[PDB]
Amino acid sequence: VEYRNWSKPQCQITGFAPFSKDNSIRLSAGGDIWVTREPYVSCDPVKCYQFALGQGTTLDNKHSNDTVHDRIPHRTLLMNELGVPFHLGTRQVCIAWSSSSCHDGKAWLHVCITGDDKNATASFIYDGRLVDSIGSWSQNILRTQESECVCINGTCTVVMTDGSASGRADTRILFIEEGKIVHISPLAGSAQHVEECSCYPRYPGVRCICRDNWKGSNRPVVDINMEDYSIDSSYVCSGLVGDTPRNDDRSSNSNCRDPNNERGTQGVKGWAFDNGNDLWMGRTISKDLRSGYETFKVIGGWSTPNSKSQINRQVIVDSDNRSGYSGIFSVEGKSCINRCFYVELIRGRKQETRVWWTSNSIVVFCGTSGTYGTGSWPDGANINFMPI
Amino acid sequence: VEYRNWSKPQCQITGFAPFSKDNSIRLSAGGDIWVTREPYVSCDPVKCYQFALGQGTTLDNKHSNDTVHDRIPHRTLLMNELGVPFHLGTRQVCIAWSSSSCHDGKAWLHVCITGDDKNATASFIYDGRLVDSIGSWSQNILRTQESECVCINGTCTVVMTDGSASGRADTRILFIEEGKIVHISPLAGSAQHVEECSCYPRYPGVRCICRDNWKGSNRPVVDINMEDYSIDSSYVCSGLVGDTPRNDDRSSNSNCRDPNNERGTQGVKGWAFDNGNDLWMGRTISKDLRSGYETFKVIGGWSTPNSKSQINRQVIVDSDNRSGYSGIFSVEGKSCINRCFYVELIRGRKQETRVWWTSNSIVVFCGTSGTYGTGSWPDGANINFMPI
Amino acid sequence: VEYRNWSKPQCQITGFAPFSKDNSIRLSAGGDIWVTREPYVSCDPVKCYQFALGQGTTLDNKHSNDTVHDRIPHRTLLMNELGVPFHLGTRQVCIAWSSSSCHDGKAWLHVCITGDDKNATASFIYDGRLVDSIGSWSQNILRTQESECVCINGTCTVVMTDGSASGRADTRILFIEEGKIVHISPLAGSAQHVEECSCYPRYPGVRCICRDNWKGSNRPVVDINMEDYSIDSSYVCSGLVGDTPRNDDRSSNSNCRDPNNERGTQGVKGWAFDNGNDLWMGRTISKDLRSGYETFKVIGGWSTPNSKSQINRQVIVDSDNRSGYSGIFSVEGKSCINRCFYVELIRGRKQETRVWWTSNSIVVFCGTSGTYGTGSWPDGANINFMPI
Amino acid sequence: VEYRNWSKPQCQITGFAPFSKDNSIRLSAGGDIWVTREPYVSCDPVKCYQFALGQGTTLDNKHSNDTVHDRIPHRTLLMNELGVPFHLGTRQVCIAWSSSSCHDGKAWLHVCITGDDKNATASFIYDGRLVDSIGSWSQNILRTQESECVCINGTCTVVMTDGSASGRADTRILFIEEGKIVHISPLAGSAQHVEECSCYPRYPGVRCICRDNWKGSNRPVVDINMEDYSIDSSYVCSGLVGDTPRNDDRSSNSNCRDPNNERGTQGVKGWAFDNGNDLWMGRTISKDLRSGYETFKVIGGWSTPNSKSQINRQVIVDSDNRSGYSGIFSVEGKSCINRCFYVELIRGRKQETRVWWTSNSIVVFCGTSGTYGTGSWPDGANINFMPI
Numbered sequence A, B, C, D: 001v002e003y004r005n006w007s008k009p010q011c012q013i014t015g016f017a018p019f020s021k022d023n024s025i026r027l028s029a030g031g032d033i034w035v036t037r038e039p040y041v042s043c044d045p046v047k048c049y050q051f052a053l054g055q056g057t058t059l060d061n062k063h064s065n066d067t068v069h070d071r072i073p074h075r076t077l078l079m080n081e082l083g084v085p086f087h088l089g090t091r092q093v094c095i096a097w098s099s100s101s102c103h104d105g106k107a108w109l110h111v112c113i114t115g116d117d118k119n120a121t122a123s124f125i126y127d128g129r130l131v132d133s134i135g136s137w138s139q140n141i142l143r144t145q146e147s148e149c150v151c152i153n154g155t156c157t158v159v160m161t162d163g164s165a166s167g168r169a170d171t172r173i174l175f176i177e178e179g180k181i182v183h184i185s186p187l188a189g190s191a192q193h194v195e196e197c198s199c200y201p202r203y204p205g206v207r208c209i210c211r212d213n214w215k216g217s218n219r220p221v222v223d224i225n226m227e228d229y230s231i232d233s234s235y236v237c238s239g240l241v242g243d244t245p246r247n248d249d250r251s252s253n254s255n256c257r258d259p260n261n262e263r264g265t266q267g268v269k270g271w272a273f274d275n276g277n278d279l280w281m282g283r284t285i286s287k288d289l290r291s292g293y294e295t296f297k298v299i300g301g302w303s304t305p306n307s308k309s310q311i312n313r314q315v316i317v318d319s320d321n322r323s324g325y326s327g328i329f330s331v332e333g334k335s336c337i338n339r340c341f342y343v344e345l346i347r348g349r350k351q352e353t354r355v356w357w358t359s360n361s362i363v364v365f366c367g368t369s370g371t372y373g374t375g376s377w378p379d380g381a382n383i384n385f386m387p388i
Ligand SMILES: *[C@@H]1O[C@H](CO[C@H]2O[C@H](CO)[C@@H](O)[C@H](O)[C@@H]2O)[C@@H](O[C@@H]2O[C@H](CO)[C@@H](O[C@@H]3O[C@H](CO)[C@@H](O)[C@H](O[C@H]4O[C@H](CO)[C@@H](O)[C@H](O)[C@@H]4O[C@H]4O[C@H](CO)[C@@H](O)[C@H](O)[C@@H]4O)[C@@H]3O)[C@H](O)[C@H]2NC(C)=O)[C@H](O)[C@H]1NC(C)=O
Pocket: A315, A318, A372, A373, A374, A375, A376, B116, B118, B119
C-alpha cells in the first residue's frame, strides 16, 4: 500500500453531473435519523464516506429542541458510506464540534475539536488510536476546516483558526505525519481572515479557498508548500465573487490582493478551484440568504482581477430553496484527479420556525467532461409534515 | 480477477423454482422501509443484490402521499444483498429516476438518470467514481432499462431511449468500458418502439426483449453485436404474446417482423428468452391489468411466427393478485449460464386508493433442470392494516 | 480451503454451559423484530449463525395476527450471526416454510421448501445460486429437518419426509454435492415415522435422532453410511424417553427396536447423542405440554434397552416456563468435535391468547468438560407488556 | 499473526484528550437503544469496541421497569465498534451478568457469568466456540472484572471473586490459553478485598488496581507474574485515595500496605496506573455519591505512602453530573503502549426516580503527550424528555 502523492493532471471538466443525495430530512419524518450540520464528504482509495457533526440526538426526539447552537459537548463526528443516511447504527468516530478527515492512502486522520470555547482541545486520531493532541492558542474557539484535509506522500495538512470571527485572528497550518503533528506554519500572504478552508491538492502543493468572516465577500486563497512548509495567501481575482452576503455582480469587485470591503464580514463555507486562468466556482444564488446554489466557470476568474465573464453556469438548487455550507473533494481517476463538491441543505430553525430543531441533507455532484442537462435537487421535506 | 466473458451454454431449464422474496409491504406496516418501484436484481461474481428507485421517503411518513409520480429529484438508486428489505440503513448508490447496473467481473457500473424531463443527464458511475456523463438527445425524458445491463470482456452495453412513449422515439445503444462511453450505435432492424429492455448475454452478443409502448403488444428484440457494435431488431414470433394490455391468445398475432397493431400502445416491462426454436416467457395473467403472473414455454415461440403451442406453464402470482414490471437476470454456474427473473408486486395508489402511497415488494425465481410443484407468492399485505 | 470431513473424537463432555440467548420477545415490545418459529443454529468454519422461518412480518404489526399457522407463502429463511436478533436489516436468505442449512467447509447449502401442501417444491441453493430443485413425491406436505444438515468431504445429507403426520409416510435421504442432488436413499431399518431429524456427524457417517409423530414417544434413529448411501433405522434404548407427550419415567419403555406405543402419536423436534453405551439427551420437563427443558445423561441409554439410570441432569428452562423445538449442532475444536444444542422458546398464541400472534426467542448451550453451576434461562417477556 | 506480548514503554503522557462518546441516553428518547450498565472498552490489534451487559430489553419498552437489579438471566454481553450505540442490530456475544474480554492478538476471549447467585457458571468463549467452563467455588456470586483482561504471548489472565461483598471473600487468578483455563493462582500479598479489577500490562507482568468493598477507600493492587503465576497484593500509597465513598483529601490516609479503614466498605470500579514514583488516577469528584469525574497525577502517589501532592488535574464530568464505573484500557502505538480510560454515566433509577428504568452512556479519553484545554462531557439527557 503506497501513499497518495496525488501526481496527476486535474481532469479538464465540462461541468458537474449529479453524484449522490441522502434525503435525510425527508426520511426523518418517519425514521430515526440523527440531527446534524456542517457536513462534508471524502473518499479513501476505494470508496467515499459522508461526515457530519451530529447533535447527540435524533430529530423525532424532544432533545432536538434548540439545536441551532453550534457547540455542545454532545456533538461527535459521524461517518457512513456515501449514500447511507445517519441512522442509529452510525458510528460516531470521535467527539467534535469542528473537524477535518483525510486518508493518506494507508489510513484515516480525523481532527476533532471539543471543549470550552475559551479553552478547547483538538485530538489527532489516526488509524484508530489517538496519536496527538493540541490546545487552544488564542483562547477563542479553536476551529478547523469542516471538510477534508489533504495528504501528499504521508504528510497531511489541515489549517486551523483561533481568534475573533468578526475581527482579527490567529490562523495556523498543521503538517502531521501519521497522527503526529510535525510542524506548524503560521499564515502568510495578503489574507485578512481565514476560516473554513476548502482544500484540494495541486501537486506538489495544497490549495485552499477559505472564508473571510471579517472584511471580504471575495474568498481568500492559501498556498501550502508541502516541500518546505512555506505559505502564501491571496484572494480570488473574479469580480464575480462567492460569499454570502455579497454586493452583486455588477457592483462587485476583487483585485485578488485585498478584502473587497463590500458586505465583507460574515460569510459561509464555500469553494472554488483553478483551471488555467479560469475558475470553477459555486455560491448560493441569493446574496443575502444562503438560498439556492449555482455553479459556473469564470473566464479569467483565477489570474485576472475583477473578471466577470462567466460561462457554463448550472443551478444545483433553485433559488426558492435553502442551501448552506459547501466544500470540495478530490477523487483520483485512472488518468487524472477530478474535483467534486457537496452542498449542505439546512432546514428548520432560525429561518423556519414551525419546528424547533435544525438539521440538513446533502447533495453531491462531480466533475465531468461529458454532457449533462438541467435540474434542481433541494432537500425536499415538507416542513408541515415534520415533527415539532 | 478476470472479466466476465460469459462463455458457457445456457442451462437447459425445466422451469423455475422459488429463489427469494423480501416482504416489503408487509414489513412496512410496522417498520421503516423505503417507498420504491421499478425494481430489479443483478449479481456480481459472488452474490446478488436487489435494486429499486426509492421515492426519497418511507411508507409510514406523510411524505409518501402522492408517490404515484415517476420522476421527482428525490428518487435515488437503492442497493442491498438479495433478501434484505430496503430499511433505513440502505445505501442510495446514486440519484436516479431511471437505471441499469451491471458488474463487468471487476466492478459495478450504474447508469443513473435525473433532471428535467426535457433536459436530463445520465451519469456513468463505475468503481465508485463518476467516470462519464451524457445528456438528453431528444429533449423528451431520457430513459434506460430499469434492469441489469451486460458486460462481455470489459465492455458493457446499456440501451436508452429519448422521445415519445405513445409515439416515435430515438433509441440508442451505448458501449461503455470502465464507466467511459466508448461508442453509441443507434437502433436498426424492424422494431418500432424500444423501451425498458430486458437484456441477457448470448455469447458473443447481447439479446434484449423490450417494450413497445406504441403499436405492439408483441415484444421487440434487440441484437447487439459486441464484436462490431452492429445492431438488429425484430419482434417475437409467438402468437402467444407477452405485453399488457394485449388481445388474447386466440385472437393474438405476431409475425416476428412488425408490431401486431393489437391493443399495441402502452405496455409494461417484461422479458423472454430463447432455447432453440423455443421461448421461455412470462406475462401477467390479466391482459388489461397487471394482475397475476404466469410463465410457460412456447414450442416454436422463437423461430416460428404466430406459434401458440405452449407447455410447462407455471403461476408465480395468482390472477387475484397484483404484479407489475419484470425483468431477467443471468447467473453463471460451474457448467452453464442460467437465467432467472424477478417480479415487481406494486401496491397502493391509482389502483388501490385506501392509502395515498404507492410501493412494492418483489419475488424472484430461478431456472432449474430439477423438478418442482405448484404455488402462488403475492405481496401479501392487507391494505386495511396499512398506514394512510 | 479444504472440505469438512469432521475426522475427530467427539469431546468427552461433562454437561452444558450457557452459550447465547437473543431476547427476541422481550425486545419485540419496543423494536421491530420479526415473527418467527422453527429456529436453529449452525456454524461455518469461523462463526455461528441463527436461522428461523419468519412469518413475513413484524410483531408490532397488524399482520402478526393469526401467525399460529405453519405454512403461508411469506415464510422465508432468516439468517444472522449468533446473538443478533432478527431486526429489519436481516437477510431473508430464501423462501421457505421448511429448511436445513449446512456448510460443507467451502460454502452454505440451504434447502428451502414452499408451495402448495399438496404440491410443494424444494430448492437447493448453494453458494448463492440455485443449483437444483425437487418436487413433492407423496403429494402431502414435503418436509425437512428444521435444523442443520451435515457434510463430510463435500457431500451433504439432508433427510426429508412427505406423507401423513399421524400416519404412514415416505421418508428419503438426499445426498447432494455442491447444491446438486446426487443420490436419494429411502428409509430402512425399524423406524415407523421419521420427522424433523436432528443430525450430527459420527465420522465416517451421520446419525440422526428424529421425531415419531405416529406411534412412539421414544425417538427414532437414522444411520446414514456416507461411503455407500446405505441406511439403517432404530429407536433409542433409554426407557427414559424424550418426546412430548410421553408416558412417564416409571411407566415408560423402549426396546430400541420398535415404537413404544405409549402416547405415541404427535411429538416435537428434539435431539440426543451417544457416548459409549450412554446417551446425552434433553426433553421438556412437562410430558403433556412443551414446558421447561431439562438435559441429563443416561447410563446405558444408548446400548441397553429400557435403561433409566440417569445422571448429570440440568434444567435449562424451569417447568413454569414454555419451551418447544430443540435440535443439536456440532462445532469443531482444535482436538475434538463438540456437540451443542438450541431451544425454541415459543410464546403467544394457542396457549397464551392475550395476544393474537406467535413467535419465539432462543437459548443455546454448549458441551463442556469443565464445571458449571445451576440456573434457568426462559424467554422472559411479560405478556402483559406485549403488543396486541 | 503474532501474539501480543506488549513489549514497549508506557508512553509518557501529559494528560488525557477526548476520544469517543456514544450518546446513548439522549438517543434512547427517540430510538431503540438497549438498556445496559457495567460497560467497558477494549481493542483488537486494529480497532476498539465497546461492551456492556444489556438488560435483555430496550429503554422505550415496558420491560425496562425495575432494571436497577444487577442479575437476571436476560443480561447478555453486547459488543459494537467504538462509537456505535447499542441499537437493535447489536450482537449479544454471550449470556452474562459479569464479564471480561480481551484479544490475545489472534482472537477474542470473553468470560461470561450467569446462573444462580449461589451456583453460577463462567463460560470461557474463545474464537467463537466455548472452550471451557468453571463453577462457583464459594457459592456466593462468582464475579469478574467488568473490564478488559490482558494477554501476554498467548496466555490471558482474568481475576475473579466469589464470596461476601461487605465481608471476607475468595479471590483467584485465572491463566487461560486459547479459552482453556491453564492455572488458577489464588490471592497473595496484603489485600483485604479484591473486586472489579482494572488490569493493564506492564511487561512481563499484569497490574490491577481493584475495588475493596469491605474496609478500604484506598485501592488494592494485584501483581501477576506471567512467568510463574506468582501473585502479590498491596494498596496504593497516595493519601489522595480513589474510591467512593471516601473520607476527604485532608483527612485521608494510605500506607500502601493495609486498608485505610476510612468509609472503607462499599466502593465503585475505578482505575489508576503508575509512572515512576507517580500515579495517574481518576475518581468521581463527589466522595459520597458517584458524581462528576476528575483525573490528576499524584507526585509520589505510587511509591511514597500518604502522598497528596497532585498535579495536572482535569475534570471529565462536572460535579453537578452523574458518573459511575470506570476502567482502563491499553493501546499499542508505533513506539509505546498508551493507556486510556472509559467512564460509565449511569442515569435513571434509585437516584433519579421520575423514570423507572436504569441505563447509561459512556465517555472515553486517551493519554496524550500533546496539549489540551478544559471541558465537561456528561450524559446530556433531559430526564423530563425521557420515557417512563
Ligand atoms: C437544459 O434544461 C434547461 C433547464 O433550465 C432551468 O429552467 C428553470 C429556470 O432556470 C429551473 O427550474 C431549472 O432549475 C433549470 O436550471 C432548459 O431550459 C430552461 O427553460 C426554462 C423554461 O423555458 C427557463 O425558465 C425561465 O425562468 C422562469 C423559471 O424557470 C419562467 O417564469 C420564465 O417564463 C417565460 O419564459 C419562457 C422562456 O424561458 C417562455 O417559454 C414563456 O414565455 C414564459 O412566460 C412568462 O412571461 C413572464 C415571466 O417570464 C410572466 O409575466 C408570465 O406569467 C410567464 O411566467 C422562463 O421560462 C430557464 O431559465 C432555462 N434554463 C436554462 C439553463 O437554459 C435548457 O433548454 C437546457 N440548457 C442546457 C445548458 O442544458
